[PDB]
Design a protein around this ligand. Structure first.
Ligand SMILES: OC[C@H]1O[C@@H]2O[C@H]3[C@H](O)[C@@H](O)[C@@H](O[C@H]4[C@H](O)[C@@H](O)[C@@H](O[C@H]5[C@H](O)[C@@H](O)[C@@H](O[C@H]6[C@H](O)[C@@H](O)[C@@H](O[C@H]7[C@H](O)[C@@H](O)[C@@H](O[C@H]8[C@H](O)[C@@H](O)[C@@H](O[C@H]1[C@H](O)[C@H]2O)O[C@@H]8CO)O[C@@H]7CO)O[C@@H]6CO)O[C@@H]5CO)O[C@@H]4CO)O[C@@H]3CO
Ligand SMILES: OC[C@H]1O[C@@H]2O[C@H]3[C@H](O)[C@@H](O)[C@@H](O[C@H]4[C@H](O)[C@@H](O)[C@@H](O[C@H]5[C@H](O)[C@@H](O)[C@@H](O[C@H]6[C@H](O)[C@@H](O)[C@@H](O[C@H]7[C@H](O)[C@@H](O)[C@@H](O[C@H]8[C@H](O)[C@@H](O)[C@@H](O[C@H]1[C@H](O)[C@H]2O)O[C@@H]8CO)O[C@@H]7CO)O[C@@H]6CO)O[C@@H]5CO)O[C@@H]4CO)O[C@@H]3CO
Ligand SMILES: [Ca+2]
Ligand SMILES: [Ca+2]
Ligand SMILES: [Ca+2]
Ligand SMILES: [Ca+2]
Ligand SMILES: [Ca+2]
Length: 1052
């Protein structure tokens, strides 16, 4: 065998160092360093020019056809250029050429800031700027990137060796595959001969199927190569190295181990004989189980037993280890650092944690000590068995602090805690009970798994209800801040933020300024930042040290189900981890099985960040299993009625469906839904998207009705926030001063809205804005088909959610100056009526019934108690409490200043009216099975619309729900049909579509009287209906002694 080796030449030094007003660029001639011919550099030249970005050149020649900037000199390693400078700071613009052809196809930007001696090297066909020729030389003849992919036992996908004579999988157990002192690569290796990709490999990694394939001997000891660094290497016939790169091994790891590893259970497990510990770590050299005392002293250390089939490590000990703290002491190679790392890691399958998740803890979740009294018989107060069960779901999306941080009627020690939901006499709980009785059915909880971004050591935390001096004790940036004078003040941070409201403006955004520092060290975060997937969050417990949070969490769940009467949904975030690599405190999965649980760039091997953070890999089998095992615990041990998957579109459809069947085997009524946008991962697998989930029963948030009713889209800014009026804010019927919405555009929004009120089915047939027959899927939504679902239970409609501006803030951006406060309250209820009276699952943000505002904050995840406040004492809606944070809403301060003060801020009278409006809407939703048909074909045969086509009265939404014989049986004994009429318009309107029938106003609305959304509706003797401006009316035909003719859908 030929010995792979470096170039038979030295590692180059610097040819010349720049002097004052000079810079030097070396071109390192890799190919001519392979000598042969003493190559000629006469045609090499640099194109140099100044612009607004880089302007440090003294005599730049702008003529692109000028090729006279030839090398100042050259040696065996390549030419160099001495470039005069006007200054020694900043940067210069360089293109490196041969004649007029670029040898680097990229404008090079050489910064004197990053390169202090202004003496840099570059290589042809590469855009990187190196500080020395040795650096660039070692780049070319050393390990770089990670584009080889060991994807099963016998196959290695790599481009860097396609049609090269020598191609090779080297491996070193304990050091980094560096050439030895004889410039030779003398480490052990396996031999690869070109081959043809499996049909099962391409079906597994389709984003790689165009990679050049290679074969491994049918007898390689994969167990041994995967114990250390592997480096795929190639070179030419002489043996001079061509390239060398690191290997990604998740493919082979799954081929080798996953079948065996999936049969095992993981974490610290109480058996009848004792406790069994098991962690999956197929590449680890050693795993030691470290037992800790309650004071976190090592009291035992146990080398674990490796199972060579699964790559899992196990140890068994006594039952007295229940309650013990533990970590896994790992000895494992990490490709990012290229070191065999040694560190202790918490259990990825942890079910109990110490304060701030520093240690995992052995726990038996079944202990009656961890259960509220009665736990084992806690039942689901709302059925989820049938589709008509599911369609009835009416979700109230809430956050632990948003619920109780501000409520003085919650005991002080329960504020911002799980146990605030047990404070039966608080304003918050009494108000939620009111919502439940009126037809809100589900609480959805923003992250209550163990998040990373709140410090659970209370001494390191300052909240705005505490003295400003506590804020200075714990946030050392405050002393350096223009708020430092307040450290002495003796007043709370809350008091200071209030006092700062007076002089706050788009010119002096001071409330936001103080709050940005507050955000760093407070108790507040949405929490989309997973530390441990299957432990409750610690900071929401009264005591975060140990098992306390488990009983407190379950006590909350029981209170919601048993005292409030609602089902509970959990937000789960399996699409990313909080950190990765061998360094960061919150890297758990990537410390134990490096590069397996994260999704990597196929070339750099860098962990991807398209989700926000550290993208995870649910396409890999053991993460798929981790997700499924985790959900099993939340389902069985915490009695969670359903799960909302954050960025579900980043998961394979097959993985979500797999997880769902696993969980349905535990509880058949469990409900799955999520964000099914476009992840850009369709090249790797069929993503779990709105489109691909058609018919599966997996729900998705529909952005269709959302944007039609709100106006615009979530990326609007500046004037577009006001110009883009929605149906709810008077598009085309009550225009504001800036908008140019046409009647056609407004009628298109009404199409989307009607479509969504019928469940946003792909196959639902309606009359569109132009009078034309269209299928649900034929209504455009930003180019995509609008309707996309098979059943309404697959669609979650909403007009407000934790992310993006509240509904009230959108209405304030968009409402014409002439809409007075009462009209804006009706715009809110009218907007919500499209959701509450539609066939899709109904979803809403906590506080929409209180006109909730965030002071125009569009992304409030870290904006603290101040901007996320919800006042259950009903004094205001949190509007106009300061300019929102400039980092995300600064480019909106202008439009905000123009619209902010058009009308008064909602006070107690408006909040009570909105709450009555909202309860009236939810009571209507559950008043009849007709609103919640469940089945897509049943919707199609019973749901129609009047006031359609090109001469529709703009903004008037009229839906009919048939309960007469030309659709089927009478689902409702009381009525033969229902008419839903939403008149989102400043004019009163009259309906003649129902003249002659016995139409009459629903009893709920008649009982609300002057407070009804239908106050002032008139039904004439002949059956014509007059609708007030900005109203919602639900009309019925009373049922006769047999099922009548009702409101037959017309066949279009
Ligand atoms: O004013 C137009 C322009 O303004 C800005 O560009 C400035 C830029 O930021 C400065 O750095 C500098 O530009 C220098 C540039 O950075 C260097 O790369 C170099 O340019 C050379 C190219 O590298 C080289 O490849 C070749 O370019 C040829 C192209 O390969 C070829 O495709 C064709 O170009 C035509 C394009 O096909 C066509 O798209 C159109 O170009 C328009 C741009 O698409 C459009 O973005 C805009 O450009 C802005 C730009 O956004 C700002 O950043 O308008 C363009 C003009 O219509 O038409 C092209 C030809 O008409 O042909 C070229 C020429 O052979 O050679 C060039 C040689 O210049 O040097 C640049 C100059 O030092 O300055 C500009 C401002 O002047
Ligand atoms: O990842 C960065 C991003 O994260 C957060 O955004 C989240 C957002 O809050 C959620 O609503 C959701 O977004 C999904 C959305 O709900 C769905 O409807 C759909 O989005 C479609 C739109 O409905 C549709 O309008 C169209 O989008 C077009 C825009 O209308 C148009 O303006 C333009 O967008 C450009 C922006 O103008 C420009 O500012 C820039 O956008 C960047 C933002 O400035 C920056 O804040 C950040 O966005 C964050 C965001 O703040 C978080 O809240 O990065 C943005 C770039 O990614 O550039 C835009 C051009 O890309 O053009 C688009 C069409 O190209 O189609 C979209 C796409 O289907 O799906 C959305 C999923 O992405 O979730 C996201 C992610 O968590
Ligand atoms: Ca240098
Ligand atoms: Ca935590
Ligand atoms: Ca915070
Ligand atoms: Ca990709
Ligand atoms: Ca009936």
């Amino acid at each position: 065998d030929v010995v792979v080796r470096l170039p038979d030449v030295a590692v180059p030094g610097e040819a010349v160092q720049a002097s004052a007003r000079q810079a030097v660029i070396h071109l390192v001639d890799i190919a001519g360093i392979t000598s042969s011919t003493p190559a000629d550099y006469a045609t090499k030249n640099l194109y140099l020019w100044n612009n607004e970005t880089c302007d440090a050149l003294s005599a730049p020649v702008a003529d692109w056809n000028d090729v006279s900037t030839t090398p100042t000199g050259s040696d065996k390693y390549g030419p160099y250029w001495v470039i005069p400078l006007t200054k020694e700071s900043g940067c210069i613009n360089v293109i490196v050429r041969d004649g007029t052809n670029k040898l680097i196809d990229s404008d090079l930007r050489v910064s004197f800031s990053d390169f202090t001696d202004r003496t840099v090297s570059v290589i042809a066909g590469n855009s990187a700027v190196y500080d020395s020729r040795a650096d660039a030389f070692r780049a070319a003849f050393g390990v770089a990137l990670a584009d080889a992919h060991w994807v099963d036992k016998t196959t290695l996908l790599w481009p860097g060796g396609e049609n090269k004579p020598i191609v090779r999988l080297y491996y070193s157990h304990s050091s980094k595959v560096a050439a030895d002192s004889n410039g030779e690569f003398s480490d052990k290796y396996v031999k690869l001969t070109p081959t043809t990709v499996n049909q099962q490999v391409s079906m597994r990694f389709p984003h790689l199927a165009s990679y050049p394939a290679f074969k491994l001997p049918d007898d390689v000891n994969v167990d041994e190569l995967l114990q250390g660094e592997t480096v795929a290497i190639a070179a030419e016939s002489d043996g001079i190295l061509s390239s060398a790169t690191q290997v990604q091994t998740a493919g082979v790891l799954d081929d080798t181990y996953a079948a065996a590893a999936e049969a095992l259970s993981y974490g610290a497990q109480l058996t009848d004989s004792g406790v069994t510990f098991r962690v999956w770590a197929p590449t680890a050299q050693q795993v030691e189980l470290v037992i800790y005392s309650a004071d976190k002293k090592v009291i035992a250390s146990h080398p674990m037993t490796r199972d060579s089939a699964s790559g899992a490590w196990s140890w068994q000990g006594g039952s007295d280890l229940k309650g013990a703290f533990y970590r896994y002491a790992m000895t494992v190679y990490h490709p990012q650092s290229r070191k065999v790392e040694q560190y202790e890691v918490t259990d990825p399958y942890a079910h109990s944690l110490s304060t701030n998740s520093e240690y995992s803890q052995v726990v038996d979740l079944n202990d009656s000590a961890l259960k509220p009294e009665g736990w084992d018989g806690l039942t689901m107060p709302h059925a989820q068995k049938t589709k008509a069960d599911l369609a009835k779901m009416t979700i109230h999306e809430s956050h632990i602090r948003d619920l109780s941080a501000w409520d003085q009627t919650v005991p002080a020690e329960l504020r911002g805690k799980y146990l605030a939901l047990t404070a039966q006499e608080s304003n918050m709980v009494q108000h939620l009970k009111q919502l439940s009785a009126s037809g809100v059915t589900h609480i959805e909880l923003l992250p209550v798994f163990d998040l990373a971004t709140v410090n659970e050591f209370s001494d390191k935390v300052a909240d705005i209800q505490q003295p400003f001096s506590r804020l200075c004790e714990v946030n050392s940036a405050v002393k350096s801040s223009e708020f430092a004078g307040y450290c002495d003040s003796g007043s709370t941070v809350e008091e200071v933020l209030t006092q700062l409201k007076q002089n706050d403006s788009k010119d002096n955004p001071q409330v936001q300024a103080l709050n940005t520092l507050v955000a760093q060290t407070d108790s507040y975060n949405w929490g989309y930042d997973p530390f441990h997937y299957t432990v409750p969050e610690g900071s929401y417990a009264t005591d975060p040290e140990g098992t306390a949070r488990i009983k407190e969490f379950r006590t909350m769940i029981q209170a919601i189900k048993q005292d409030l009467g609602m089902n509970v949904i959990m937000d789960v975030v399996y699409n990313h981890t909080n950190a990765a690599g061998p360094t960061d405190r919150t890297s758990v999965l990537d410390k134990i099985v490096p590069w397996y649980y994260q999704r990597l760039n196929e070339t750099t091997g860098s962990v991807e960040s398209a989700t926000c953070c550290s993208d995870s890999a649910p396409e890999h089998r053991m993460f798929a299993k981790l997700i499924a095992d985790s959900l099993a615990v939340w389902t069985t041990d915490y009695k969670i009625d359903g799960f909302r998957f954050d960025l579900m579109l980043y998961h394979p459809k097959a993985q979500i469906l797999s997880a769902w069947e696993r969980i349905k085997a535990l509880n058949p009524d469990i409900y799955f839904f999520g964000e099914g946008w476009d992840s850009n991962q369709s090249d790797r697998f069929e993503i779990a998207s709105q489109i691909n989930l058609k018919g599966t029963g997996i729900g998705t948030f529909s952005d269709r009705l959302r944007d039609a009713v709100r106006g615009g889209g979530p990326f609007d800014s500046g004037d577009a926030l006001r110009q883009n009026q929605g149906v709810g804010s008077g598009a085309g019927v009550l225009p504001n001063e800036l908008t140019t919405l046409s009647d056609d555009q407004a009628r298109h929004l009404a199409d989307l809205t009607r479509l969504g009120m019928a469940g946003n089915l792909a196959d639902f047939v309606l009359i569109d804005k132009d009078g034309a027959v269209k299928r649900g899927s034929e209504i455009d939504y930003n180019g995509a088909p609008g309707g996309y679902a098979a059943d309404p239970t697959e669609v979650v409609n909403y007009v407000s959610k934790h992310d993006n501006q509240t509904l009230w803030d959108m209405i304030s951006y968009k409402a014409a100056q002439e809409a007075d406060l009462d009209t804006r309250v009706r715009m809110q209820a009218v907007s919500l009526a499209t959701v509450m009276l539609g066939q899709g699952i109904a979803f809403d943000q906590q506080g929409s019934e209180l006109l909730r505002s965030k002071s125009f904050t569009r992304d409030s995840y870290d904006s603290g108690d101040w901007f996320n406040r919800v006042d259950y004492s009903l004094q205001d809606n949190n509007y106009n409490v300061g300019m929102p944070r400039s980092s995300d809403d600064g480019s909106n301060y202008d439009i905000i200043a123009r619209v902010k003060d058009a009308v008064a801020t909602p006070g107690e009278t408006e909040l009570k009216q909105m709450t009555a409006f909202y309860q009236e809407l939810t009571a209507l939703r559950k008043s009849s099975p007709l609103f919640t048909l469940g089945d897509g074909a049943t919707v199609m045969k019973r749901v129609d619309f009047r006031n359609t086509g090109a001469d529709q009265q703009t903004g008037l939404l009229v839906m009919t729900i048939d309960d007469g014989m030309q659709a089927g049986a009478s689902l409702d004994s009381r009525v033969d049909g229902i008419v839903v009429a939403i008149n989102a318009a400043p004019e009163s309107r009259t309906l003649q579509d129902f003249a002659g029938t016995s139409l009459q106003l629903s009893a709920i609305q008649q009982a609300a009287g002057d407070r009804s959304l239908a106050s002032g509706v008139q039904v004439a003797a002949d059956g014509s209906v007059t609708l007030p401006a900005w109203s919602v009316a639900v009309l019925e035909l009373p049922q006769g002694e047999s099922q009548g003719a009702g409101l037959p859908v017309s066949s279009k």
